[PDB]
Design a protein around this ligand. Structure first.
Ligand SMILES: Nc1ncnc2c1ncn2[C@@H]1O[C@H](COP(=O)(O)O)[C@@H](OP(=O)(O)O)[C@H]1O
Ligand SMILES: Nc1ncnc2c1ncn2[C@@H]1O[C@H](COP(=O)(O)O)[C@@H](OP(=O)(O)O)[C@H]1O
Ligand SMILES: [Mn+2]
Ligand SMILES: [Mn+2]
Ligand SMILES: [Mn+2]
Ligand SMILES: [Mn+2]
Ligand SMILES: [Mn+2]
Ligand SMILES: [Mn+2]
Lengths: 303, 303
């Protein structure tokens, strides 16, 4: 059980994995967890999904898997090495905390596997209206492998397949180990959302999760990468600006076919025929954050 | 310090890394070490060089290294994760032993890095006449990334660059941590060679290293992959059949330019103008092995 200064980490520890399709509020979610005094998530590691994908490709190739098994590099060996690699990155790339956490969006395509490597780990799958996520990719020019930012239809098709896989993984892991978290409900009702989430995680309530913007860059708080694309959004308090700014910007033929391009919308409970849906009524807390954000209380940082 | 059954392993343990350009006697070398009662090398892991190459490419890209540093995934973090990953594979893919060892040929392109990750590790760089190694690749159709098996000139050019890099790494690591082992001298004088090698390693002499063919497939002995391309050679005792069977098979224009294609030949002490060199006089031990091999005492295994 390797140490950090005095916190011990190991494959049996309670870990939190946060993920989902990029542009779904995954940075906001992990920032609110980072605010909790018992948790550290930190920035996207980038390398954890890369080594997962490679290791999965080794076993999917019949030829490579035979060579590896003949060499004694069995699944048992691959699994022990993946555990060791992932724990070191999670443990070392940020401050120590009692509960460690990782947010790399596409790790949730592998939640079944991760839940076997880490038997007391839990998963938060961020779910956001595919139309809002795709509009974010395209307008912010966020580069994602496989997503052609010149085509709403292609991005929505890829969004649909991505969340289809991650949602199935979530369902296979089961209600005790993976919780779908709806972005729109997180923004409309942050206190109610975090209360359910922390209860699902087995972690005591702390108000700090509702104050993540007080804790940017502070010891025990929210560490941000200046390069990550959500940084200038997450430094503000929870607000409504991004709930449905996609309405009106989707080509008419894609609106027409929305239910066929993205059947996962209705699977997940979204109204694929509304432009936009009424997602709910915001807490006064969030209404007040929103008007302050829109009127200019929060300045763009110089960096 | 993770355990195995009772042997403890960790980043400070004495490890042996064996490598060199493929087709240079690296399997024979590691088989003779596997014969020693204190050492286990085992089969090529395949994945250790793959993850090294990826991790090196992360830091060589200015853009990726900035993103990683901004995420807290520094060299210190990358290095701890590489140590953890590599130790698990080395430790788990074969039987436990007091001294662990790994043979993946191209790991010796990274011996400086490996010697920093593993401060009591040592390196055996196998050196074989580039003409014999390239002739082996081509005639046995051994697939190596970058080596065009239709061109002796291209393979010799790639051989030359490969051994140039590994030899420089060996020299930078220094005489106390890396030993060039000449294939031809290993075959001509196996006892004298292994006595020097084991002294360089700080390991007591054991006759077992001269009996590796008695120990194929046995507990505490030499484990082989049925798929690896040297398996049907290494099951025989040390012999002379492969010393210079390349003579006469190299195109005349390549013989003409040998010193310019492969200046590393003369750097390493080989005669690039002789077809072939007289590499030395064999021990009677090896002369007797050779005639038994050539007359058919050792049958091709049914598998
Ligand atoms: N404080 C905050 N309140 C509400 N949404 C926020 C937020 N900080 C970030 N988000 C939203 O999180 C989305 C990014 O999710 P991710 O981190 O998974 O890429 C961005 O949506 P938009 O690009 O549409 O504005 C951003 O607006
Ligand atoms: N018992 C043995 N005696 C001598 N050479 C041996 C040997 N077992 C294997 N080798 C040689 O080791 C070379 C392979 O090196 P590597 O394991 O690094 O790919 C092969 O050369 P050839 O293909 O020319 O016959 C093989 O002959
Ligand atoms: Mn915290
Ligand atoms: Mn506050
Ligand atoms: Mn940072
Ligand atoms: Mn042994
Ligand atoms: Mn014997
Ligand atoms: Mn085997």
């Amino acid at each position: 059980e390797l140490v950090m200064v005095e916190y011990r980490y190991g494959k049996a520890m309670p870990l939190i994995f946060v993920g989902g399709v990029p542009r779904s509020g995954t940075t906001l979610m992990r920032a609110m967890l980072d605010a909790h005094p018992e948790v550290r998530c930190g920035e996207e590691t980038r390398i954890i999904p890369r080594v997962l994908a490679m290791r999965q490709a080794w076993s999917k190739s019949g030829r490579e898997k035979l060579r590896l098994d003949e060499a004694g590099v069995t699944d048992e060996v691959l699994d022990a090495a993946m555990q060791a690699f992932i724990l070191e990155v999670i443990a070392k790339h940020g401050e120590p905390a009692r509960v460690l956490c990782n947010k790399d969006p596409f790790t949730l395509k592998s939640s079944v596997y991760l839940s076997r490597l880490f038997p007391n780990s839990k998963f938060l799958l961020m779910v956001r209206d595919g139309r809002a996520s795709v509009h974010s990719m395209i307008t912010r020019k966020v580069t994602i492998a496989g997503f052609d930012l010149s085509s709403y239809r292609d991005c929505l098709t890829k969004w649909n397949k991505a969340i289809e896989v991650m949602y199935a993984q979530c369902m296979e892991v089961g209600k005790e180990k993976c919780l779908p978290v709806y972005y729109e409900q997180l923004v409309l009702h942050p206190r109610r959302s975090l209360k359910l989430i922390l209860d699902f995680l087995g972690i005591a309530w702390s108000d700090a999760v509702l104050h993540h913007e007080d804790l940017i860059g502070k010891p025990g708080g929210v560490s941000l990468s200046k390069i990550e694309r959500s940084t200038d959004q997450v430094i503000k308090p929870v607000n409504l600006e991004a709930l449905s700014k996609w309405t009106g910007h989707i080509p008419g033929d894609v609106v027409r076919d929305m239910a066929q391009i993205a059947p996962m919308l209705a699977q997940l409970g979204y109204d694929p025929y509304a432009n936009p849906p009424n997602y709910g009524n915001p807490d006064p807390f969030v209404i007040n954050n929103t008007q302050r954000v829109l009127k200019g209380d929060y300045k763009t940082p110089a960096n």
